[PDB]
Automatic annotation (TrEMBL), chain A:
Residues 42-163 form the D-alanyl-D-alanine carboxypeptidase-like core domain. It comes from Bacillus anthracis (anthrax bacterium). This is D-alanyl-D-alanine carboxypeptidase family protein. It comes from the Bacteria. GO terms for biological process: proteolysis. GO terms for molecular function: carboxypeptidase activity; metal ion binding. Residues 88-98 have a biased composition (Basic and acidic residues). Zn(2+) binds at H98, D105, H157. The chain holds residues 55 to 243 of 243 of the full protein. Residues 88-101 are annotated as: Disordered. Signal peptide: none annotated.
């Protein structure tokens, strides 16, 4: 239990993770996924996986069907991905939130389960925006906050931070702002 | 003209110069019985009937040689392409109407050895190399072969196969692009 293993840890362009960093409590959440089988991207840290299950349940109660697309991604994966674009998700290895195991990309069939801006205009994307905090999630890179987060709007990308999500949502803040960074 | 002639033909040529009608969606779209890299039935699950049955034959020929291919994305409508283009301007270069995926004759394929991704790395796999040399056996061509950018308008896409039927073998053997084969 160190600073970067905190559920409230900030990982961004400025603040990176150790290169060997892999959470030790990875599990696959019991939710529908946009691909079949088990892959490393199926996993989240246990607390975040349980919260994702809760989130999908709450969505279902209101007729909203979400699908999980991509969770954990290792340092090594990020390295290869950074190269493939050195020729936005141009995060250097060790600087992607996905390596924390606290972040899941989610989408919906109405958006072809793809991670695109169109997801924002679906009832599912709209619901996610206003309800993610009910399960301790925030939309990590909200619209208009590019200069702060370093990322263009990603309506599909949710980060588990626990109880502070509700305050962050209510105050319309980024994680950076909440943490005085 | 900027409009593809014989737009519904199995041998139609659709590229940056020649576009499809904006309201064109093939009427014989079906889901080929093959493994996919994604779950569920979506627009990209489909190919025109003749191309779908050809893809099945292709995957079966592959399997007999221990080659496991996965289908990644087939049909893409004009309307889908329109938002993808807009949200990438604010290769993914194809303007709406000018992607071959709208014909229903085109399937992006990959393999687990390339993590089912549509990248150059597919070319370095046993599966990608097999596909390069065998696609024509089921009526498919590698639409954007290496070095032909000046003609096709696209960099090497080892993952992107286009069904054209019988002429594939000739196109393959002669090392020609579809544009050249059709005098376009
Ligand atoms: Cl992402
Ligand atoms: Cl493509
Ligand atoms: Zn993400
Ligand atoms: Zn393609």
């Amino acid at each position: 239990a160190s600073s970067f293993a905190s559920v409230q840890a900030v990982v961004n362009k400025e603040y990176g993770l150790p290169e060997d960093y892999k959470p030790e409590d990875l599990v696959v959440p019991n939710v529908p996924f946009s691909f079949s089988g088990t892959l490393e991207k199926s996993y989240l840290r246990k607390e975040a996986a349980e919260a994702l299950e809760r989130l999908f349940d709450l969505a279902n109660k209101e007729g909203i069907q979400l699908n999980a697309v991509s969770g954990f991604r290792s340092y090594d994966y990020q390295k290869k991905l950074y190269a493939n674009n050195v020729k936005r998700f141009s995060a250097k290895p060790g600087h992607s939130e996905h390596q924390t195991g606290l972040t899941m990309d989610v989408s919906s069939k109405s958006a072809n389960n793809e991670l695109e801006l169109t997801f924002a205009n679906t009832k599912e994307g709209k619901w996610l925006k206003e309800n993610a905090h009910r399960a301790g999630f925030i939309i990590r890179y909200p619209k208009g906050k590019e200069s702060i987060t370093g990322y263009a709007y990603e309506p599909w990308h949710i980060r588990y931070v626990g109880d502070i999500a509700e305050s962050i949502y209510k105050k319309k803040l980024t994680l950076e702002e909440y943490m005085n960074l």
